[PDB]
Amino acid sequence: HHHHHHSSGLVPRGSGMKETAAAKFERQHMDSPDLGTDDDDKTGGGRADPAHRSPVPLPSPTSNKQDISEANLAYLWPLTVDHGTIECLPSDNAVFVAPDGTTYALNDRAEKAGHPPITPIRAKGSGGGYISLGALLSTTLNLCGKG
C-alpha cells in the first residue's frame, strides 16, 4: 500500500506543536493479521524498501517512564534479557525492570536502597570486563528529570 501526498515530505524541523490542541480528531487504525505466509511467491511487504535504519525510534514517553527493548538499541543491547522497562520512582531513584519481574538498580541511589545491580543479566565480553550499561542509565536519568 503506497500513497502519494502533494505536501512536502518530512523535514528536520520535526512534527512541531500547535498553539492550541485540536478539540476534535479522527480515529486511526492499523491492520495486523495474525495469519500470514512467507513461502508463497508473494511477499507480505510491498516492493518499496523498508526502513533504512534497523533501530526502531523510542516509544511515546509517559512521564518518568519508557519501554525499551533490544529492537530499539539494535546490537548495542548489552543485556541478556531481550527487553526491559525503565522507570523513575517518586523517590528520585532510577531502576530497570526486566520481564522476569525483578527490579535492578540503575543509578547509585537505587543501589544504596539495597536493590541488586543489573550485573546478573549483563553480558560479559571477551575483553574489557563487562559491556557498559552507560547508555541505559542515561535514558533513565532523563526520565527522572535530573538537572
Automatic annotation (TrEMBL):
It comes from the Bacteria. Keywords: Lipoprotein. This is Lipoprotein. It comes from Microbispora sp. ATCC PTA-5024. The lineage of its organism: Bacteria, Bacillati, Actinomycetota, Actinomycetes, Streptosporangiales.
